[PDB]
Design a protein around this motif. Structure first.
Motif, PDB file in Angstrom:
ATOM      1  N   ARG A  31       0.461   8.547   4.879  1.00 34.42           N
ATOM      2  CA  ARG A  31       0.519   7.130   4.403  1.00 34.42           C
ATOM      3  C   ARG A  31       1.053   6.240   5.526  1.00 34.42           C
ATOM      4  O   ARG A  31       0.588   5.121   5.674  1.00 34.42           O
ATOM      5  N   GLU A  32       2.066   6.670   6.286  1.00 30.66           N
ATOM      6  CA  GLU A  32       2.618   5.866   7.397  1.00 30.66           C
ATOM      7  C   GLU A  32       1.587   5.772   8.512  1.00 30.66           C
ATOM      8  O   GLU A  32       1.478   4.699   9.136  1.00 30.66           O
ATOM      9  N   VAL A  33       0.765   6.786   8.751  1.00 33.00           N
ATOM     10  CA  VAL A  33      -0.325   6.680   9.730  1.00 33.00           C
ATOM     11  C   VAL A  33      -1.276   5.565   9.292  1.00 33.00           C
ATOM     12  O   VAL A  33      -1.670   4.748  10.153  1.00 33.00           O
ATOM     13  N   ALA A  34      -1.650   5.534   8.032  1.00 30.54           N
ATOM     14  CA  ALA A  34      -2.608   4.502   7.582  1.00 30.54           C
ATOM     15  C   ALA A  34      -2.011   3.114   7.779  1.00 30.54           C
ATOM     16  O   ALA A  34      -2.766   2.229   8.222  1.00 30.54           O
TER      17      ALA A  34
ATOM     18  N   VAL B 202      -2.298   2.369  11.651  1.00 30.24           N
ATOM     19  CA  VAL B 202      -3.709   2.154  12.031  1.00 30.24           C
ATOM     20  C   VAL B 202      -4.095   0.737  11.576  1.00 30.24           C
ATOM     21  O   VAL B 202      -4.716   0.021  12.381  1.00 30.24           O
ATOM     22  N   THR B 203      -3.718   0.379  10.359  1.00 29.23           N
ATOM     23  CA  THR B 203      -4.039  -0.984   9.860  1.00 29.23           C
ATOM     24  C   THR B 203      -3.374  -2.046  10.714  1.00 29.23           C
ATOM     25  O   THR B 203      -4.059  -3.018  11.181  1.00 29.23           O
ATOM     26  N   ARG B 204      -2.085  -1.896  10.950  1.00 30.13           N
ATOM     27  CA  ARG B 204      -1.277  -2.867  11.718  1.00 30.13           C
ATOM     28  C   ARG B 204      -1.863  -3.075  13.106  1.00 30.13           C
ATOM     29  O   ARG B 204      -1.880  -4.210  13.617  1.00 30.13           O
ATOM     30  N   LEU B 205      -2.342  -2.020  13.754  1.00 30.19           N
ATOM     31  CA  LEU B 205      -2.823  -2.070  15.135  1.00 30.19           C
ATOM     32  C   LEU B 205      -4.169  -2.810  15.212  1.00 30.19           C
ATOM     33  O   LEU B 205      -4.554  -3.213  16.312  1.00 30.19           O
TER      34      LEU B 205
ATOM     35  N   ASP C 123      -8.517   6.635   3.154  1.00 27.21           N
ATOM     36  CA  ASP C 123      -9.737   6.167   2.460  1.00 27.21           C
ATOM     37  C   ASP C 123      -9.712   4.657   2.305  1.00 27.21           C
ATOM     38  O   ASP C 123     -10.794   4.079   2.323  1.00 27.21           O
ATOM     39  N   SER C 124      -8.560   4.019   2.167  1.00 25.56           N
ATOM     40  CA  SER C 124      -8.486   2.551   1.954  1.00 25.56           C
ATOM     41  C   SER C 124      -8.539   1.810   3.289  1.00 25.56           C
ATOM     42  O   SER C 124      -8.497   0.549   3.268  1.00 25.56           O
ATOM     43  N   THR C 125      -8.494   2.515   4.430  1.00 20.16           N
ATOM     44  CA  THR C 125      -8.601   1.874   5.752  1.00 20.16           C
ATOM     45  C   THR C 125     -10.077   1.739   6.151  1.00 20.16           C
ATOM     46  O   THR C 125     -10.938   2.495   5.649  1.00 20.16           O
ATOM     47  N   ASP C 126     -10.376   0.790   7.030  1.00 14.87           N
ATOM     48  CA  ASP C 126     -11.764   0.608   7.500  1.00 14.87           C
ATOM     49  C   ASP C 126     -11.963   1.048   8.942  1.00 14.87           C
ATOM     50  O   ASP C 126     -13.013   0.800   9.513  1.00 14.87           O
TER      51      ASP C 126
END
Ligand SMILES: [Cl-]
Ligand SMILES: [Cl-]
Ligand SMILES: [Cl-]
Length: 163
Positions: A93-96, A99-102, A136-139
């Motif tokens: 979850r912290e990876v996702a 990844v989103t933040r970056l 799954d919720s990341t693009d």
């Protein structure tokens, strides 16, 4: 975001990835470690400046402009199956979040807690399912890296099963 966010799997060294950032299977102390962590230390040693972070967390450190997300899965030698399972889910979850933040369009990711931290058990499905739950919720395009030929086939099957 990726135009058509995908999962893929490759059998090779994640230090040779073709993605916009990498997830390290880190230790909590920011040490060079073994397996993926040692490959990552050889390729991006600058990213180990203040990379220490607790189990179940991820900490990003830039190597130049290339982000290295240090994700600390639990060592199943020390954790109970229950607590380890919770921390392994939390690390992804912290990876996702990172990844989103970056704002990256792609990320190279290993299966956390499947090597030396597996407590001698096959955790492909457990680790991969927690990866999917988080990502799954990341693009971002996600490219999973592994070293074993049978693991490659099983990860590929799991990806294809969901279509
Ligand atoms: Cl290779
Ligand atoms: Cl591991
Ligand atoms: Cl593997």
């Amino acid at each position: 975001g990726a135009m058509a966010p995908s999962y893929r799997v490759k059998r090779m060294d994640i230090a040779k990835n073709d993605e916009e950032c990498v997830v390290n299977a880190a230790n909590p102390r920011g040490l060079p470690g073994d397996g993926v962590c040692k490959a990552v230390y050889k390729k991006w040693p600058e990213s180990f400046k203040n990379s220490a972070t607790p189990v179940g967390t991820a900490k990003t450190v830039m190597c130049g402009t290339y982000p290295v997300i240090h994700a600390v899965g639990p060592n199943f030698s020390n954790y109970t199956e229950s607590e380890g399972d919770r921390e392994l889910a939390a690390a992804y979850r912290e990876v996702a979040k990172e990844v989103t933040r970056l704002g990256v369009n792609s990320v190279a990711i290993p299966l956390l807690s499947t090597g030396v931290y597996s407590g001698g058990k096959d955790r492909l499905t457990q680790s991969l399912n927690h990866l999917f739950t988080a990502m799954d919720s990341t693009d971002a395009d996600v490219v999973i890296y592994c070293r074993d030929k049978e693991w490659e086939k099983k990860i590929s099957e799991a990806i294809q099963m969901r279509t």
